[PDB]
């Protein structure tokens, strides 16, 4: 039994981060940390042997057997450190191949916003509110409304032009759903700009 | 370059049905491995083998059956699909000596959703919501949006194409699609995407912006028997025009 910090976890771009879990089992000798990217396969990043800790660039992986303790650090997040990180224990040899893997921990590195100009746009047409342009101190939360959608914040690089930007978007087919309410149940910031 | 590959990609099933599911390598591996996991939740090990036909169970193996016919290939397969074998499922591969420290080499996932009335599949309904003027003025720039709607099963992969070429820049799609009714077990989902261009690049009236959504459903040898549309595996889209 492998216990995984079973977050989502959610960071600004250069923090560190740290990955954890704990197990039961003492016989566990090999310590592995794999990737996993949004609908994708699990792919192997870092593995050490017993107690002790081993370094490979921005990355840290750490074992401590006597406390059943193990951890994954990354130094300077980067966006594309953005997805589901597992970890997977086998016991010494003889193991026949076998892992055990944690429930993994999803993270989402956000990345940083030079220019903000927040704003609400409402697109043309069952209608479509577009929250854009606010920097990563910004969370989007879920409408108190069960006939309004929201998807959280989504980054898009237009990079010919050297420009990210954060968007949210709100959609709801109800009778008194407008792009002045659309955002209520978010703490968004106080410049942001609703235009007619 | 050399790898672990799964097939099909994608399955849809009626409870009682069969399937098989193929994993195969050219990377000589003696360990091959079948895997089954469970939205935001880890890798349960269904059957494992050690080597050319021999298999041994994991921690999961009851309503599976596997074959390992040869080295480069290990079958997976399902007698009388159950919905709790809705899942996303993962073939991996390793030398018995190895080389990467205990760590194995994945596939990129197999989607199997086992449902209870095929009366409950349906494809996405797709839409193109046009650039804000306000956008256009205060930025210089257009977000366009596609909304994919009331689709059933959640198999599904959105694409932008601006004069018909698939473009990258610029794109913004949510990681997974969400529930439009979250207390149903069966609801049907959403998915939303977002298109960023120059305000002067949506200006051009020839521009052409199409948002694509390819469905995985209902196969020819499934039968049908409702007023509407078949809801086999295809494509949906909406499109929109540069406006001056």
Same mark, same amino acid.
């Given at each position: 039994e492998v216990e995984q910090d079973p977050?989502?976890?959610?960071?600004?771009?250069?923090?560190?981060?740290?990955?954890?879990?704990?197990?039961?089992?003492?016989?566990?000798?090999?310590?592995?940390? $794999?990737?996993?990217?949004? /609908? %994708?396969?699990?792919?192997?990043?870092?593995?050490?042997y017993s107690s002790g800790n081993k370094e490979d660039g921005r990355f840290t992986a750490q074992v401590?057997?006597?406390? %059943?303790?193990?951890? =994954?650090?990354? /130094?300077?997040?980067?966006?594309?450190?953005?997805?589901? $990180?597992?970890?997977?224990?086998?016991?010494?040899? #003889?193991?026949?191949? %076998?892992?055990?893997?944690?429930?993994?921990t999803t993270l989402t590195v956000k990345?940083?916003?030079?220019? #903000?100009?927040?704003?609400? $746009?409402? =697109? /043309?047409? %069952?209608?479509?509110?577009?929250?854009?342009?606010?920097?990563?101190?910004?969370?989007?939360?879920?409408?108190?409304?069960?006939?309004?959608?929201?998807?959280?914040?989504? *980054? =898009?690089?237009? /990079?010919?032009?050297?420009?990210?930007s954060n968007s949210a978007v709100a959609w709801s087919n109800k009778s008194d759903f407008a792009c002045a309410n659309a955002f209520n149940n978010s703490i968004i910031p106080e410049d942001t700009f609703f235009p007619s | 370059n050399a790898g672990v590959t799964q097939t099909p990609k994608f399955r849809v099933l009626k409870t009682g049905q069969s399937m098989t599911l193929l994993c195969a390598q050219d990377m000589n591996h003696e360990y091959m491995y079948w895997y089954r996991q469970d939205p935001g939740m880890g890798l349960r090990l269904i059957h494992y083998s050690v080597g050319e036909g021999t298999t041994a169970k994991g921690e999961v193996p009851d309503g599976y059956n596997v074959s390992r016919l040869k080295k480069q290939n290990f079958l997976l397969g399902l007698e009388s699909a159950a919905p709790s074998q809705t899942s996303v499922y993962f073939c991996a591969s390793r030398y018995? =000596?190895?080389?990467?420290?205990?760590?194995?080499?994945?596939?990129?996932?197999?989607?199997?959703?086992? *449902?209870?009335?095929?009366?409950? *599949?349906?494809? #996405?309904?797709?839409?193109?919501?046009?650039?804000s003027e306000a956008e256009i003025s205060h930025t210089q720039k257009a977000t366009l949006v596609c909304l994919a709607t009331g689709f059933y099963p959640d198999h599904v992969e959105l694409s932008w194409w601006v004069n018909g070429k698939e473009v990258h820049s610029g794109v913004c799609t949510?990681?997974?699609?969400?529930?439009?009714?979250?207390?149903?077990?069966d609801s049907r989902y959403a998915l939303s995407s977002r298109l960023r261009v120059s305000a002067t690049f949506w200006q051009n009236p020839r521009n052409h912006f199409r948002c694509q959504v390819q469905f995985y459903g209902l196969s020819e040898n499934d039968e049908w028997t409702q007023d509407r549309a078949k809801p086999v595996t295809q494509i949906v889209s909406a499109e929109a025009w540069g406006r001056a």
């Amino acid at each position: 039994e492998v216990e995984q910090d079973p977050g989502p976890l959610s960071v600004p771009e250069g923090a560190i981060v740290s990955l954890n879990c704990t197990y039961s089992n003492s016989a566990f000798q090999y310590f592995m940390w $794999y990737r996993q990217y949004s /609908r %994708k396969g699990p792919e192997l990043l870092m593995y050490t042997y017993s107690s002790g800790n081993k370094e490979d660039g921005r990355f840290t992986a750490q074992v401590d057997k006597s406390s %059943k303790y193990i951890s =994954l650090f990354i /130094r300077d997040s980067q966006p594309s450190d953005s997805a589901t $990180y597992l970890c997977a224990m086998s016991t010494s040899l #003889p193991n026949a191949g %076998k892992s055990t893997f944690g429930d993994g921990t999803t993270l989402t590195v956000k990345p940083n916003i030079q220019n #903000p100009d927040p704003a609400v $746009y409402q =697109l /043309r047409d %069952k209608s479509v509110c577009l929250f854009t342009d606010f920097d990563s101190q910004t969370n989007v939360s879920q409408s108190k409304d069960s006939d309004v959608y929201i998807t959280d914040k989504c *980054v =898009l690089d237009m /990079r010919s032009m050297d420009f990210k930007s954060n968007s949210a978007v709100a959609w709801s087919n109800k009778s008194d759903f407008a792009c002045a309410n659309a955002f209520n149940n978010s703490i968004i910031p106080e410049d942001t700009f609703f235009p007619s | 370059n050399a790898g672990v590959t799964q097939t099909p990609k994608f399955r849809v099933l009626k409870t009682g049905q069969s399937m098989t599911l193929l994993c195969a390598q050219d990377m000589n591996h003696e360990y091959m491995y079948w895997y089954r996991q469970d939205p935001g939740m880890g890798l349960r090990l269904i059957h494992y083998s050690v080597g050319e036909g021999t298999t041994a169970k994991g921690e999961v193996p009851d309503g599976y059956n596997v074959s390992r016919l040869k080295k480069q290939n290990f079958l997976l397969g399902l007698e009388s699909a159950a919905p709790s074998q809705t899942s996303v499922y993962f073939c991996a591969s390793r030398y018995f =000596l190895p080389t990467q420290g205990m760590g194995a080499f994945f596939g990129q996932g197999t989607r199997l959703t086992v *449902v209870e009335d095929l009366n409950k *599949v349906f494809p #996405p309904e797709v839409a193109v919501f046009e650039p804000s003027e306000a956008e256009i003025s205060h930025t210089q720039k257009a977000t366009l949006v596609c909304l994919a709607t009331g689709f059933y099963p959640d198999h599904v992969e959105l694409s932008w194409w601006v004069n018909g070429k698939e473009v990258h820049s610029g794109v913004c799609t949510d990681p997974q699609p969400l529930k439009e009714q979250p207390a149903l077990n069966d609801s049907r989902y959403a998915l939303s995407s977002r298109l960023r261009v120059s305000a002067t690049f949506w200006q051009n009236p020839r521009n052409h912006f199409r948002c694509q959504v390819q469905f995985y459903g209902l196969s020819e040898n499934d039968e049908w028997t409702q007023d509407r549309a078949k809801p086999v595996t295809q494509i949906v889209s909406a499109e929109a025009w540069g406006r001056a």
